[PDB]
Amino acid sequence: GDVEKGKKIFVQKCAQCHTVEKGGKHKTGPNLHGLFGRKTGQAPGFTYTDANKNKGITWKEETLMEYLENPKKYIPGTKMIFAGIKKKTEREDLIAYLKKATNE
Ligand code: HEC
């Protein structure tokens, strides 16, 4: 989608859990510090539930789409609470922002 709207919209409904624009600790969501290429399923501290811990994926521009669209389906019992995104644009916008969140 856009990258800027991704960031804006993200902060509008994601940052509450994922404040990835400062030294925001892993409270209700891990700070998205790399994401693309950064194999999950193994954090140094808050490594989430078993359900996510058990996954071990490289958070590519495939699995992010799957997750953000249908997170409860992608992972059957995460602590993430996000049943739907918007329609389609937001699914592409958020995932475009994070494609630069890996870099900023
Ligand atoms: C709090 C109720 C949440 C909201 C709102 C959002 N997310 Fe989230 N997310 C949440 C938890 C508890 C977890 C842990 C599971 C895990 O796999 O770490 C996550 C995880 C993610 C991840 C992966 C993190 C990683 O492994 O590096 C992504 C990519 C992610 N969440 C993105 C994301 C976005 C863009 C959100 C707004 C649409 C969003 N999350 C909201 C909890 C919560």
Domain limits of the chain? 1-104
The yes/no answer on whether domain 1-104 falls in CATH 1.10.3720.10 is: no
For residue 19, give the nearest of 65, 97, 10 by alpha carbon.
10
Rounded to whole angstroms, how far apart are CA atoms 64 and 86? 15
For 11, the token pair is 């902060």
Q: Exposed/middle/buried for 10, CB within 10 Å: 0-12, 13-18, 19+?
A: buried
Query: In this structure, how many other beta carbons lie within 10 angstroms of the beta carbon of residue 96?
Result: 18
Rounded to whole angstroms, how far apart are CA atoms 82 and 89? 16
Rounded to whole angstroms, how far apart are CA atoms 71 and 104? 25
Atom 42 of ligand 1 has which residue's CA nearest to it?
80
In degrees, rounded to 5, the angle at the alpha carbon of residue 5 between the alpha carbons of residues 26 and 11 is 25
CA of residue 48 relative to chain centroid, distance: 13
Method used to determine the 3D structure? NMR
Q: Report residues whose beta carbon is within 6 angstroms of any ligand 1 atom.
A: 10, 13-14, 16-18, 28-30, 32, 35, 40, 48, 52, 59, 64, 68, 78-82, 94
Buried b (16+ CB within 10 A) or exposed e, 19-48: bbeeebebeebbbbeebbeeebeeeeeeeb
Per the annotation, binding residues are: 14, 17-18, 80
For residue 26, give the nearest of 54, 47, 10 by alpha carbon.
47
For residue 16, give the nearest of 6, 4, 27 by alpha carbon.
27
Atom 29 of ligand 1 has which residue's CA nearest to it?
64
